[PDB]
Curated annotation (Swiss-Prot):
GO molecular function term, any single one: protein-disulfide reductase activity
Ranges of residues in domain Thioredoxin: 1-107
Disulfide linkage: C31-C34
Protein's recorded name: Thioredoxin
Superkingdom of source: Bacteria
Protein's gene: trxA
Organism lineage string: Bacteria, Bacillati, Actinomycetota, Actinomycetes, Mycobacteriales
Length: 108
C-alpha cells in the first residue's frame, strides 16, 4: 500500500503541512466509480513516489473534511500544494488522462 489513509484528525498534518504535493481521493466503500479509480491511484502512488503523495479520505467516516472541501459527489480528487487546493477533478479517470488533467499546462 503506497497510498496513505487520512482522517479528519490527521488531515492538517498529513496533507495541509506536507512538503510534497498531495493528491487526495475522496471516496466511499460502496461507490462503484471510486473502485474504477482506485488501482490507478495505487500505481501513481508507487510510480511517482518521489514527487507526489497520494492520500485516501473515506467521506463517510470523515464527513467534516468532505464538508470542508465541499465534496458533494464521488470520486473527487483534489491536489494540494503548500496547504491549498490547486486542482479539483470530478469523476473516475485513467492514469494518463488523470496526470494530464492535474497539470496547469497543455501540450502544443
Amino acid at each position: 500500500s503506497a497510498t496513505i489513509k487520512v482522517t479528519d484528525a490527521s488531515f492538517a498534518t498529513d496533507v495541509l503541512s506536507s512538503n510534497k504535493p498531495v493528491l487526495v481521493d475522496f471516496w466511499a466503500t460502496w461507490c462503484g466509480p471510486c473502485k474504477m479509480v482506485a488501482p490507478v491511484l495505487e500505481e501513481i502512488a508507487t510510480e511517482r513516489a518521489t514527487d507526489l503523495t497520494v492520500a485516501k479520505l473515506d467521506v463517510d467516516t470523515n464527513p467534516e473534511t468532505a464538508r470542508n472541501f465541499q465534496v458533494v459527489s464521488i470520486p473527487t480528487l483534489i491536489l494540494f500544494k503548500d496547504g491549498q487546493p490547486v486542482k479539483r477533478i470530478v469523476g473516475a479517470k485513467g492514469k494518463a488522462a488523470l496526470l494530464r488533467e492535474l497539470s496547469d499546462v497543455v501540450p502544443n
